[PDB]
Design a protein around this ligand. Structure first.
Ligand SMILES: CN[C@@H]1CCc2c(ccc(O)c2O)[C@H]1O
Length: 287
């Protein structure tokens, strides 16, 4: 009466369904209606594209790998799958930073905002983000610049039915730095400044109209924005650093679980970044 195959399969299918449904809905809502076509919504389009590619490509095959315990395809497909996984992850995480910086420049520089950011510059920014994402993903993995040296790694690399992730110290550290830490620092600085500006505005209003009845909301919005990202992706990169720093500190199952915890963050992005009333009207019209 085992339920391992049935129990995990249902949840794994449900995650794919949720990700694909949400991202397709967001993409078609932005594309079909001319009201929602805005410079800010291009970054949302890029993030939705990255998460949709993730949900269609990396999750279904990882599900088969976990359920079956063998890689029925060749080594070339294993390398391609690893490359596309890294590409999608880094592209999404960097697009989040781009959105944060966009909001920073919108709020802290109101008079000059319409000047420095034009619809032409957004295309260049998105192209640069995707190119940088592709440089760290396909170039090192496809040229065997990330491979390990120990006997277990060699045996895994020399077998067609095994597909496991083995990496050396330099690639792991560089990939973690490029993918996670710099965007995290930039987002922290940006959102701290935004919170300061909001508090200053509230204090300004209070002095002017305090007598008549005329920061919970800002704290709630910043918490919803930051806590989910931190909880989803912070645990994984710490163990990513440790497992090459320390040989036998961390088991493989913990690594896989913490990797899969970060995958579900793609299904939450429509809930966080697409709650605008215009988006709700568009969703009502489509469905
Ligand atoms: C096989 N899973 C990979 C392993 C390493 C890695 C991931 C994502 C982003 C990175 O920058 C990485 O270095 C994970 O998705």
């Amino acid at each position: 009466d085992e339920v391992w195959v049935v129990g995990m399969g249902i949840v794994m299918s449900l995650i794919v369904l949720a990700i694909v449904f949400g991202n397709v809905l967001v993409i078609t809502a932005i594309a079909k209606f001319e009201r929602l076509q805005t410079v800010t919504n291009y970054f949302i389009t890029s993030l939705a594209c990255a998460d949709l590619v993730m949900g269609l490509a990396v999750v279904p095959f990882g599900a088969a790998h976990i359920l079956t315990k063998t890689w029925t395809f060749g080594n070339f497909w294993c390398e391609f799958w690893t490359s596309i996984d890294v590409l999608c992850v880094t592209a999404s995480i960097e697009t989040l930073c781009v959105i944060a910086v966009d909001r920073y420049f919108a709020i802290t520089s109101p008079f000059k905002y319409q000047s420095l950011l034009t619809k032409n510059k957004a295309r260049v920014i998105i192209l640069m983000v995707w190119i940088v994402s592709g440089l760290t993903s396909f170039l090192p993995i496809q040229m065997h610049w990330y491979r390990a040296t120990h006997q277990e790694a060699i045996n895994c690399y020399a077998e067609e039915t095994c597909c496991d992730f083995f990496t050396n110290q330099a690639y792991a550290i560089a990939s973690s730095i490029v993918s996670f830490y710099v965007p995290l620092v930039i987002m922290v600085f940006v959102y701290s400044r935004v919170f300061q500006e909001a508090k200053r505005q509230l204090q300004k209003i209070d002095k002017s109209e305090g007598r008549f009845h005329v920061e919970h909301k800002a704290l709630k919005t910043l918490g919803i924005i930051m806590g989910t990202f931190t909880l989803c992706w912070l645990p994984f990169f710490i163990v990513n650093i440790v497992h090459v720093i320390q040989d036998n500190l961390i088991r493989k199952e913990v690594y896989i679980l913490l990797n899969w915890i970060g995958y579900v963050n793609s299904g939450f992005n429509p809930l966080i970044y697409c709650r605008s009333p215009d988006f709700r009207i568009a969703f009502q019209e489509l469905l």
